[PDB]
Symmetry: C2
Subunit: 146 residues, 2 copies
Amino acid sequence: MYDAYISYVNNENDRKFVNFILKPHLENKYSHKLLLNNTNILPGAEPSAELLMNISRCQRLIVVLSQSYLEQEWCTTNFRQGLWHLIELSRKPIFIIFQSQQKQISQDISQQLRQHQPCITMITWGAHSMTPSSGFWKELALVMPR
Amino acid sequence: MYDAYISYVNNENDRKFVNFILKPHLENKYSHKLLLNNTNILPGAEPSAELLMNISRCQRLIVVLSQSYLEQEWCTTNFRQGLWHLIELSRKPIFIIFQSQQKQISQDISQQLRQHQPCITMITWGAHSMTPSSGFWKELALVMPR
């Protein structure tokens, strides 16, 4: 049924980005019906129940992979296992990272994300974005359904 | 229409493996209809003609990634780009490698294949295999259609 599933953590910056920037744009021009939650989709580095039951009715998975998101226990203790689970559960999860925060992204996380690069989409957000013609919205459009 | 696409090079070992072991087994119990060619699917490290037109009517891609296969030009000159094209063209290409030949496989290629590990399937062939219940045939069954 749904076009995408949006996994984020509920840090102020992140929730304004999800609810004011991203959710309105994908719901308008691209006509999408979105599912989204700010809980831990990988408790114990194993898929949660809400995610196991909900993802099967979503075509894509967008992770708002911020510094606050990357502080979660699965991110800090077994990012490979969780990334495996994401890739295996949706096929081509999209990961939104932030140019301002890439300072903070630890070595192993950036390497794991580039390593799988054809499989996963890495989208980056800078000052350039928000103009609907943008590297960001171009990329996110090409990886969305139809 | 087709279950799998089998890319091999036509070195003695390879064509006998494709035609006597693999094609008969996958076409029997697993009821598969197989497409296969021994030409270069990545000329100039870009998809060939038959591969682009045929792959759209195939659900899986198996590469018989032997020592002889890896001597081809795209393998030796731009294996990352060709692997990118494969991942982008089929969704989870399967790569059959040989335990006897993993000896000969250079560093960069083995590591590129492990890098993408959730996305691509790596199946390895040893003395154990050919018993239809096999680490090999179990794995190859779990990555095949339905």
